[PDB]
Amino acid sequence: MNYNNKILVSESGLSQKHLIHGDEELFQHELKTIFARNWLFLTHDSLIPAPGDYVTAKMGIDEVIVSRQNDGSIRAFLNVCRHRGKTLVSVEAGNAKGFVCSYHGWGFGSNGELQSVPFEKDLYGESLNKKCLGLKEVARVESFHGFIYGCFDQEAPPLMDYLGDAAWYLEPMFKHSGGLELVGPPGKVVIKANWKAPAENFVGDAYHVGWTHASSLRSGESIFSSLAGNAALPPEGAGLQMTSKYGSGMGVLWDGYSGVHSADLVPELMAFGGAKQERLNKEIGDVRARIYRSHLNCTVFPNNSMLTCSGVFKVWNPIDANTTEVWTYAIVEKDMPEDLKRRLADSVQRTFGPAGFWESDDNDNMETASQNGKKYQSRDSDLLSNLGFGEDVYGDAVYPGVVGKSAIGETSYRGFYRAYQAHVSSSNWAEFEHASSTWHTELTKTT
Amino acid sequence: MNYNNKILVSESGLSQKHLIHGDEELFQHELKTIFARNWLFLTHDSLIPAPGDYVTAKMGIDEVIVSRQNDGSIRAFLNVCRHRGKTLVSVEAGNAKGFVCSYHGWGFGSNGELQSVPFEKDLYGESLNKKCLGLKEVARVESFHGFIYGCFDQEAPPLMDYLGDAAWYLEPMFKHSGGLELVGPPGKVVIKANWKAPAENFVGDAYHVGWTHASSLRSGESIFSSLAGNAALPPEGAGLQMTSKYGSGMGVLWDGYSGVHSADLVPELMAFGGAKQERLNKEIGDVRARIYRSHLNCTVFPNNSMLTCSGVFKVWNPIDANTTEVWTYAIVEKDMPEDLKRRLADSVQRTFGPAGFWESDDNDNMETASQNGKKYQSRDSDLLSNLGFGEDVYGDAVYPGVVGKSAIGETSYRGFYRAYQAHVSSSNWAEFEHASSTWHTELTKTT
Amino acid sequence: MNYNNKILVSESGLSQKHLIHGDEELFQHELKTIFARNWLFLTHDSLIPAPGDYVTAKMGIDEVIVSRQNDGSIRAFLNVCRHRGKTLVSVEAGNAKGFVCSYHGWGFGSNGELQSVPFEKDLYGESLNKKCLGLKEVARVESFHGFIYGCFDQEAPPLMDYLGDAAWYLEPMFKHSGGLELVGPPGKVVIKANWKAPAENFVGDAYHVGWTHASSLRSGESIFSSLAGNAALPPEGAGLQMTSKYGSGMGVLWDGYSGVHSADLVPELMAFGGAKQERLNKEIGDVRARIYRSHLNCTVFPNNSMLTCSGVFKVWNPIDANTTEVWTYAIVEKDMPEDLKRRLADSVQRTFGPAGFWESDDNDNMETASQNGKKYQSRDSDLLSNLGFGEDVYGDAVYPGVVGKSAIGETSYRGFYRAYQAHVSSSNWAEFEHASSTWHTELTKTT
Amino acid sequence: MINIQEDKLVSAHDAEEILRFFNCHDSALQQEATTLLTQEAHLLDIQAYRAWLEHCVGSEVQYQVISRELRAASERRYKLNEAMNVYNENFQQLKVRVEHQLDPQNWGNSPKLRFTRFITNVQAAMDVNDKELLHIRSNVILHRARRGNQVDVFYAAREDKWKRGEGGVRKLVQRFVDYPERILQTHNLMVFL
Amino acid sequence: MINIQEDKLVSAHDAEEILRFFNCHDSALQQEATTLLTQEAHLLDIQAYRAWLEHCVGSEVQYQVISRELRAASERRYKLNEAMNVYNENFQQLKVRVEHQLDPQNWGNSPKLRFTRFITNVQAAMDVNDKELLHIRSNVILHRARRGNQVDVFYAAREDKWKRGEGGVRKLVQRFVDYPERILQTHNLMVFL
Amino acid sequence: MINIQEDKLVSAHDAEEILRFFNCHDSALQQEATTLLTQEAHLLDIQAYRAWLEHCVGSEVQYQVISRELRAASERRYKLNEAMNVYNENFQQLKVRVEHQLDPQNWGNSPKLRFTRFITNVQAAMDVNDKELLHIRSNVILHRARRGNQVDVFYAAREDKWKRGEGGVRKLVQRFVDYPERILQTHNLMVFL
Ligand SMILES: c1ccc2[nH]ccc2c1
Ligand SMILES: c1ccc2[nH]ccc2c1
Ligand SMILES: c1ccc2[nH]ccc2c1
Ligand code: FES
Ligand code: FES
Ligand code: FES
Ligand SMILES: [Fe+3]
Ligand SMILES: [Fe+3]
Ligand SMILES: [Fe+3]
């Protein structure tokens, strides 16, 4: 397939060929043009706070070691020995000053440097140039309020610029709340779906909630309930949708601070969020303090998603076109009482973790939509994302980005797939920028 | 591989490259040139008799919904939602007026039409063109005496013309008996064989019966027994073989109406078949009434096979070059006493179903012949199908098609593989017809 | 990938692209240029001593039948019926005068000839040319002191010439000891590693022993122990490394005749080997009699490896780029008391068989190094094999081949990968010879 | 114990079988049923099929394994045959299958197959009306290996009726299995569950 | 019995659980625990989740399944949360999960799922301080099949506390499972172990 | 009970083992053997290998797991070694394997492995000649998990001899397993069956 010319995503992100969720040659091409080029979630300061603390993380199909340096910075390296290529670290987290390979015993520091080689004097004499044998380093590692992202491409925009217009919506909760912490270890489960199926669902799909999650809402005992079985459409003005130049986007459901949490947590959460919003009105304004305690369903391009307020944090790690390894963490506000943190973390896993009853509602939807992309008569069929098209705006005075002023639509799918198209048909960041110089105009046609 | 030029099947169907049972690029190419172009078995009137009754069926690797319409006709649609591509129906059979998607709740009628979209007025207003969003429909659906076949290619010959010369041999049992019924549900099992391995065996392989099935014949207590272990070659004039332009063919074993059924059913069946043959002599002639109660081992190109009289009915559903999902039904004559129908159905499953002791004899033959097509030194080797070559005729005064007047041979393999060659090297039905304008002359060389 | 031009192995075998352990297109290309062109281990005289005795063996991904003929020679044939390609023999060893196919009953002799076809007169008449329907025969089958190797390429050098300079090192134990026997059946286990990972480890990796096998050496109670955990570097002059034109090579650890065997066998073995060495000093000289009772870790290109003295004999049978089926036999000297043979055979399996505690130490090293060759950021990385480079000699007066006069190095990796490069970029044996006309000069640069 | 109007996923058949075991519990009967099933599974594992027929199987046996079509949980209109019979054997039909296993020309039994069976969750209760008859429920994991690298593992619950017979030789008179996997991925179901 | 300074791979928790069972062995208690667990596993297999809650689960239950992060065997410095909770349910939370299973709009339960459970290695010992409480250990293999060709098999050891309750109705008050597979390859862990 | 001229698939060895259990059945012995094997499998599952050696393994033990070459069912001429030994260990050799598991530099044991064992089909019979010796047969399913997504499951029947020992400490004197899968697809057989 010629990725310069093939129209995988139609103009304005209106539809996508169904083969994008099943074609293995495209998956290999996404390893280069999506995963080796864009910013990918690694860890949080709260999981590696002290010098020597490390974790392992995936970046696309590659595994990296992410380590807190003595100077307080974070560096990340491929988890592959520079000698004969064995996997260096076999655990998920720890604290160490270095990593020793179990094959021939080479020892690498936490800074990636080749520090020791067994019997180096007797064997290599002075021939081994250890300075050129450090671990392969992830070129770019940056933080968004404690959330650490990596990028293999030295040419990528800074992470804050890459978040584009989505950053404004995340800031109330990520910055103005006092900061978030990531509660570990994550749950980890394999699903037989393409990575894009859960990413598109979290970036912009409020339409499926009442029907897909009818049993979880009804059994559940949460605040978005009345939607069970599509028995009620949310109030006019109940939310909005947004998308951005580099693909990140989200939905905003006004004031749903208890999110998916059952009735057992509703009162305490509605009480904590509304008290912090009152303090925040004076600091960041009423609209932004309301956004803080409003439920955001967001995908940070490509494959990191979250539900703020509900506190769900996901990584959709690609394995092949119909296989994804799902990592699920909880996010909590650092100034919440400890006991409430613990209960919220269990609640996140109860609803969206490995045995999450809400996440289980989505399994068949994500798996079958992905697997049908391999079926002969469906490969060239068109997946539709036209809901709300021609009513989206850009440059609004109150809400930034390409915005759909309605709680349910497909605005965020169109922005995600416009960015995906521009990456798959580009050889580098400069070409993506050239392909995206009229990004918001393309998304707002008909409006 | 260039399928216009590569000689996968030699002139006159005499040999085939062994790679045809193992090459995955060829399997993908067969999805287009075999499965998306030819007639494939779907269901029987007896399994969806009433308005609203439906079943799911495979057509190649695609899954379709096959539904009885209110006007009495049958229509079939891809089992894929027109919105974001989820699988619509997750059951195998039922009765409904429509199908609702579990992802966003779109509702499709039994006629494939997009009938309802949740909150369509509030969300899409008048923008959604539901008339262009019906399920993708199978272009052609036709019946052969209650047996329903589908074809994705609008250009295919009518099903009766596609059966060609094989139709004359099937008519005594399918039409003149009063009609057949298909007894459900089928048994369903995966085998590690290419779909062509069982198809070629049922279309034309009487040679393997005495040796492959030596234990089943000897233990079994059936009428074709004495062949156990090749202890006896059937009488001169014990049967014939035939093949046709579009690939279907069969073997005819005169008067073996009890087929593979053990001794417990022999007497009652020999008594029912011979009584109906006496009535049929006056209606269709002695030869055709004898064919009615003669055992036919047939493949209806590409992947539907049957044993008449024994009542075995198979679909060899392709999954990949060395994987096939085998569906096994029983066929019974509608005017047979109910109790005899029930016993014959169990007998079909006893001998050829999931725990069929005769079908288990073939497993290693079908699996290893298919898997050896992947092995380096065997890919370019030649599978032989020359038995009987130069003794086949065409246009006989009594038996139609390309006919080998001997019970054991490879006539039907040659016709199947001539048609397969002509499809794999053709881009459409017109090219197949041009490649088949001297089909019977090619098969009768040396005669 | 263009294998004429792609530099998979750098000049002088100094480094290899990591993709060689993970790329499936390269694996398919190795089936042609490595496995269908070079000499592959089949069996030993001791496993098929009498007329009619046979075994099955893999040659690359192909399976062959290896049979002792009535005249005392050995012939080997593809294990594939010449009719419709079923696998002929389903057992691993036996004694027979012929093999009958279970599909249609064709009978082949032990000499590969098509001897009988069921009902040949009635069915084929005189049409079947059985003389052209013998099993596909392995062109070349030769012995090295009872060890039987096969090659599909009629053009390959004779096996003795193909062993090149390695033959001189094997002869003390394979020939001058009085002869070896292979003790069967082998252990058989699948590992998720490329075949080259264990082949390179056995051909030239003494560096990993102290670290990888620290627990086995320490627990073990063997003579190479003191190396546990790299607590001691072997004495100056403790061994040497060698490699040869066609890729075979080994390491020599002077006098380690008890090898990996625990302390329970040490005394008896050190006593048997030193007594035979005293007799051999008069026959073959002191250096060669010392080599007899010195531990050799060798790979006979491509995928046969051994540890002499320890008595481990391996075949690394390729299945795909990250799958290998490991066959493990024991080798014993024919004149060792029976009871000592039995104990040595169990000891080989105890340490390196299916539940071998030393072999289990290598699993993660071999599997992860191979699987990391598939990871995007590692495919184009360089595996290093430069230890000892610039100190290797050729044409020494006492030790033949390209020799590194040090016990630990990477001399043998460089020779293995120089030969591998020359095969993967060559279309035939003549081109390999042209690509190898300065083989030893390339390996001894800097010296 | 079960109310199937409230416990919406439970079938009437399954609720009846639970009622049979939670009432009269006889620990001795459970132990006897455990021994009986362990001995039957040893005879099958060593492929002593004639000994199994002679010692464990009654002349009036019905040995039945069904495969149920997948239908909607809310289905109430479609009323065609719900399941085919993978096995539905009388004694003579079992004897035919045993002769097929033992025939020298059953080529698929060379090299000899290897069977291992794991019988758990044994429950036993006497029939209320026929005191010759014991209801025994048990679950089986069956592992069948052959030809170097073919491994198939079967999983099922068994609803049995065994009758006293004579001389302490209890014999199976009914075995019913509703096989849990609709599409088999074990090549065939050619094993005695 | 265990010295964990010598038996270097054994955790303090595991060594305490072994001590509980090797001392006071009551064969009758083991048989009673076997019956209890076989009945619980039959109710779950037939998806009688309300009957399971009513008959087998105590009002004070903690039903907990953890997933432990993979850490170095020599780790001693990193001291952050060692494991998340796949389940950590009280009675009300179990009731929510049962209502979710039984809801007519739980689309993933159509076609009906098929469960088979295999309970082995049962050990039982009374608590030293609370004589209402029995410690029961058992291992489970759970097979969940659906949709023609989806088969998931779960494996785990269960550390339970059951209390006498009233009327002979022993009820689970604590279930603890440390799930052995870190990355699940069963699509989800949405089954009651 | 078995006639191996009639039951053509049965080996002489297997027919002898069936004879041992169908005669003298002692229910108490079966229960005792069940407890013994459940305790041994708990020690192994928690990786208390020294405690296993000390409490469960006799000084005269032979611990043997074979792998038999695949030969024709009608073979009668080829008479070379029929099987290799995956294990054929005395007490000292088992001790070496336990020290290897416990060594700090056994890199493959970091992150700690997770084992779950399922022991079923227990049968027990006293030896006719040595009254210190009990024959115990049992089947095991063994699940070994590690490194996030590596899962290996082993299946086997075990023919054991256990001797009374002293103080109620019954100890294994012989374990024989004929492993059913010829080519292993579990990476290695480095587990104690
Ligand atoms: C609430 C709203 C929108 C959502 N998209 C995915 C989960 C989810 C929850
Ligand atoms: C009888 C005759 C021919 C046949 N081909 C396949 C099955 C079969 C049965
Ligand atoms: C001793 C020395 C070198 C070796 N390479 C592989 C095994 C081995 C043992
Ligand atoms: S592969 Fe890491 S030290 Fe050799
Ligand atoms: S995918 Fe079917 S309604 Fe959206
Ligand atoms: S495939 Fe061997 S005789 Fe036909
Ligand atoms: Fe959802
Ligand atoms: Fe057949
Ligand atoms: Fe090693």
Task: List the domain boundaries for chain C.
Answer: 1-35+165-447, 36-164
Q: Of B311, B172, B168, B316, which is closest to residue B244 (Cα–Cα)?
A: B168
Q: Do E118 and D139 touch (CB under 8 A)?
A: yes
Residue C148: exposed, middle, or buried by beta-carbon count in 10 A (0-12, 13-18, 19+)?
buried
Cα–Cα distances in angstroms (integers) from residue D142 to residues D193, F11, F143, in the given order: 7, 20, 16
Q: Do C387 and A124 touch (CB under 8 A)?
A: yes
Angle at CA of residue A380, ends A378 and A384, nearest 5° = 80
User: From the CA of B325, how many Å to the nearest CA of chain E?
Assistant: 11
Name the residue at shortest CA distance from atom 6 of ligand 3: C202
Residues of D within 8 A of F123 (CB-CB) are 38-39, 42
Place of tokens 């417990």: B264
Q: Which helix (H) or strand (E) holds E156?
A: strand E150-163
Specify whether the CB–CB gap between B180 and B146 falls below 8 A. yes
What is the rounded end-to-end Cα distance, in angstroms, of chain C? 34
Name the residue at shortest CA distance from atom 4 of ligand 4: A104
Neighbours of chain E (3+ CB pairs under 8 A): A, B, D, F
Q: Which helix (H) or strand (E) holds F178?
A: strand F171-178
Token digits of residue F192: 């104690």
Provide Rg for chain A, Cα atoms: 22
* Annotated binding-site residue numbers of C for Fe cation: 208, 213, 362
The residue of chain C with its CA nearest to that of F82 is: C185
Q: Is the dihedral of CA C24, C25, C30, C35 positive or negative?
A: positive
Show the domain range for F160: 1-193
- What is d(CA C150, CA C148) in angstroms, rounded to the nearest whole number? 7
What is the rounded end-to-end Cα distance, in angstroms, of chain B? 34
Interface check D35 vs C, CB under 8 A? no
Provide Rg for chain B, Cα atoms: 22
Q: Of E157, A284, B2, which is closest to residue F117 (Cα–Cα)?
A: E157
| D171 CA to centre of own chain | 13
What is the rounded end-to-end Cα distance, in angstroms, of chain F? 29
- What is d(CA B139, CA B154) in angstroms, rounded to the nearest whole number? 6
Report whether residue B202 contacts ligand 5, using a CB cutoff of 6 Å: no
What is the rounded end-to-end Cα distance, in angstroms, of chain D? 29
Rounded to 5 degrees, φ, ψ at E88 are: -155, 65
The domain total for chain D is: 1
Q: Which helix (H) or strand (E) holds A94?
A: strand A93-95
Q: Which residues surround ligand 7, an ion (CB under 5 A)?
A: A 362
Specify whether the CB–CB gap between F40 and F52 falls below 8 A. yes
Residue F22: exposed, middle, or buried by beta-carbon count in 10 A (0-12, 13-18, 19+)?
middle
Residues of F within 8 A of C184 (CB-CB) are 69, 80-81, 84
- Please name the member of F55, F101, F114 whose beta carbon is closest to the beta carbon of E1: F55
Residue E50: exposed, middle, or buried by beta-carbon count in 10 A (0-12, 13-18, 19+)?
buried
B362 CA from centroid of ligand 2 (Å):
11
- What is d(CA C255, CA C259) in angstroms, rounded to the nearest whole number? 9
Return the CATH number at F167.
Answer: 3.10.450.50
Name the residue at shortest CA distance from atom 6 of ligand 2: B202
According to DSSP, the residues that pair with A300 across neighbouring strands are A304
Cα–Cα distances in angstroms (integers) from residue A443 to residues A402, A431, D29, in the given order: 7, 19, 74
**C377-401 per-residue burial string, b: 16 or more CB within 10 A, e: under 16:** bbbebebbbbbbbebbbbeeeebbb
> A36-164 adopts what CATH topology?
Rieske Iron-sulfur Protein (2.102.10)
Q: Of C396, C390, C434, which is closest to residue C414 (Cα–Cα)?
A: C390
A397 CB-near residues (< 8 Å, 6+ apart): none
The minimum-distance atom of ligand 5 relative to the CA of A208 is 4
**β-pairing, F150-163 with F133-146?**
antiparallel
* Domain A1-35+165-447 in CATH 3.90.380.10: yes
User: From the CA of E184, how many Å to the nearest CA of chain D?
Assistant: 20
Q: Does residue A104 carry a catalytic annotation? A: yes
Q: How is the beta sheet containing E83-89 ordered, strand by strand?
A: E83-89, E57-68, E171-178, E150-163, E133-146, E114-126
B44 a known binding residue?
no
Helix (H, G, I), strand (E, B) or coil at E23: coil
Q: Does residue B362 carry a catalytic annotation? A: yes
- Please name the member of C212, C233, C387 whose beta carbon is closest to the beta carbon of A102: C212
Q: Of B372, B409, B377, B369, which is closest to residue B392 (Cα–Cα)?
A: B409
Specify whether the CB–CB gap between A294 and A280 falls below 8 A. no
- What is d(CA C196, CA B316) in angstroms, rounded to the nearest whole number? 39
Name the residue at shortest CA distance from atom 3 of ligand 4: A104
Name the residue at shortest CA distance from atom 1 of ligand 5: B84
- What is d(CA D189, CA D179) in angstroms, rounded to the nearest whole number? 10
A281 CA from centroid of ligand 1 (Å):
26
HSE-CB for C231 with a 13 A CA cutoff: 12
A407 CA from centroid of ligand 1 (Å):
11
- What is d(CA D107, CA D102) in angstroms, rounded to the nearest whole number? 11
Query: At B386, which amino acid appears?
Result: N
Residues written for chain E: 193
Residues of C within 8 A of A152 (CB-CB) are 377
Specify whether the CB–CB gap between D160 and D138 falls below 8 A. yes
Q: Of B42, B15, B14, which is closest to residue B300 (Cα–Cα)?
A: B42
**β-pairing, B140-144 with B312-320?**
unpaired
Give residue ranges with CB within 6 A of ligand 1.
A 201-202, 205-206, 209, 251, 297, 307
Cα–Cα distances in angstroms (integers) from residue D128 to residues C420, D5, D24, in the given order: 77, 26, 11
Q: Of B123, B121, B88, which is closest to residue B107 (Cα–Cα)?
A: B88
Q: Do chains A and C touch (3 or more CB pairs under 8 A)?
A: yes
Hey, how many other C-beta atoms are within 10 angstroms of the C-beta on A2? 6
Helix C357-371 / helix F91-102 crossing angle, nearest 10 deg = 40
Interface check F116 vs D, CB under 8 A? no
Cα–Cα distances in angstroms (integers) from residue C125 to residues B385, C121, D64, in the given order: 15, 4, 48
HSE-CB for C136 with a 13 A CA cutoff: 23
- What is d(CA B205, CA B194) in angstroms, rounded to the nearest whole number? 16
F104 CB-near residues (< 8 Å, 6+ apart): E8, E73, E74
- What is d(CA E95, CA E104) in angstroms, rounded to the nearest whole number? 16
Report whether residue C86 contacts ligand 6, using a CB cutoff of 6 Å: yes
According to DSSP, the residues that pair with B63 across neighbouring strands are B58
Q: Give the long-range contacts of residues C141-145, CB within 8 A, separation 24 or more.
A: C141/C42, C141/C66, C141/C74, C141/C75, C141/C76, C142/C39, C143/C45, C143/C74, C144/C170, C144/C174, C145/C174, C145/C175, C145/C179, C145/C180
